[PDB]
């Protein structure tokens, strides 16, 4: 305020009478003397402004040297790192409290916001409010849950997907307002048991989720006025017809796995199938208006 404003009010005053120059001449030089620019279009011609040019080079050079749509990921874990790797190409904001993490998050194609996902001021700082969804994995299930309540107190209908570390608190996470709860040690622990005899379960689950498999696992919805509305799941012979396996069909926020042969396709239904990309089309078409 009045630091480099006192040496600029002292350098334009001692260059007005000490070198007989205008107010636009004393000031225009003081900015070239303190900025060590020194065009030269106004040098000390009188030893009265030369002892002043030396004093406005100390109090002047010193005072001018030091007076001069998206997806929010809360937490930075291997899980949420593995997720960021699959959102490459979308606007992602990682909010976490360790600063060092910043490099990894940047290199991993997402924006870093240093903050504490349980503090709301920081949720805000990452525009939780209005984001496609918020994905939460904090170090401890309590912190994860705390962060969730924070978000709810903001966009109280934003989509919240969270990871549960203990099974014991799967529901408290949902209670706190998590929309979808993923529990990787449960999934893992089970595939472990299952993989004692033969590997295929652990093989299927891990592979459908990896891009390399030709077969991709997709949700295809049943659009209003569908060639298939009220139609039987069996009457529709979808597998044969389109090749796409129907593993289940999502009526809302539930999913019926392997629906009975007599299932009736309401529109708005979500179809969950694995199949070659060529035949995910066939199903999309054999389904339209």
Which residues define the annotated binding site? 137, 163, 165
Give strand ranges (E) for 227-269: 245-250, 256-257
Among 78, 98, 99, 224, binds a copy of itself (CB under 8 A): 78
Question: How far is CA 113 from its chain centroid?
Answer: 9
Size of the site for Ca ion (CB under 5 A): 11
What residues from 101 to 120 belong to the interface with a copy of itself (CB under 8 A)? 118-120
Other CB atoms closer than 10 Å to residue 112's CB: what's the count? 20
Between residues 20 and 207, which has the closer beta carbon with respect to a copy of itself?
207
Among 77, 127, 232, 264, binds a copy of itself (CB under 8 A): 77
What residues from 193 to 222 belong to the interface with a copy of itself (CB under 8 A)? 193-210, 213, 215, 217, 219
| Minimum distance, C-beta of residue 283 to a copy of itself, in the bound complex (Å) | 13
Size of the site for a copy of itself (CB under 8 A): 124
| Minimum distance, C-beta of residue 129 to a copy of itself, in the bound complex (Å) | 16
Q: What is the C-alpha separation between 147 and 161, in angstroms, rounded?
A: 12
Between residues 63 and 80, which has the closer beta carbon with respect to Ca ion?
80
C-alpha dist (Å) from residue 282 to 9, 238, 285: 79, 10, 5
| Minimum distance, C-beta of residue 190 to a copy of itself, in the bound complex (Å) | 5
Among 126, 145, 222, 287, binds a copy of itself (CB under 8 A): 145
Phi/psi at 218 (nearest 5 deg)?
Answer: -125, 155
CB-based burial of residue 126 (10 Å sphere; 0-12 exposed, 13-18 middle, 19+ buried)? buried
Closest CA to 263 of 285, 286, 236, 227: 236
Contact residues for Ca ion (CB under 5 A)? 77, 79, 137, 163, 194, 197-198, 243, 258, 275, 279
């Amino acid at each position: 305020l009045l630091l480099v404003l006192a040496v600029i009010i002292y350098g334009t005053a001692g260059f007005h009478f000490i070198e007989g120059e205008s107010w636009t001449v004393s000031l225009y030089w003081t900015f070239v003397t303190i900025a060590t620019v020194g065009y030269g279009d106004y040098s000390p011609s009188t030893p009265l402004g030369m002892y002043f040019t030396v004093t406005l080079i100390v109090l002047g050079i010193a005072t001018f040297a030091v007076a001069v749509r998206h997806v929010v990921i809360c937490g930075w874990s291997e899980s949420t790192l593995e997720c960021l790797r699959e959102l490459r190409g979308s606007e992602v904001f990682v909010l976490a409290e360790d600063e060092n993490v910043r490099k990894k998050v940047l290199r991993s194609g997402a924006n870093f916001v240093h903050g504490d996902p349980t503090r709301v001021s920081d949720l805000e700082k990452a525009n939780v409010r209005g984001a496609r969804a918020v994905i939460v994995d904090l170090e401890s299930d309590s912190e994860t849950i705390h962060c969730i309540l924070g978000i709810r107190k903001i966009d109280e209908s934003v989509r919240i997907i969270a990871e549960a570390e203990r099974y014991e608190n799967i529901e408290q996470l949902r209670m706190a307002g998590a929309d979808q709860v993923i529990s990787p040690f449960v999934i893992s622990g089970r595939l472990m048991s299952r993989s004692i005899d033969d590997g295929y379960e652990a093989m299927f689950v891990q592979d459908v989720l990896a891009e390399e498999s030709t077969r991709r696992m997709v949700e295809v919805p049943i659009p209003e006025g569908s060639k298939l509305e009220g139609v039987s799941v069996l009457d529709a012979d979808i597998h044969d017809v389109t090749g796409v396996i129907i593993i289940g069909v999502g009526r809302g926020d539930e999913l019926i796995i392997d629906p009975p042969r007599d299932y009736s396709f309401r529109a708005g239904d979500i179809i969950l199938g694995i199949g070659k990309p060529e035949e995910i089309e066939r199903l999309k078409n054999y389904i339209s208006a």
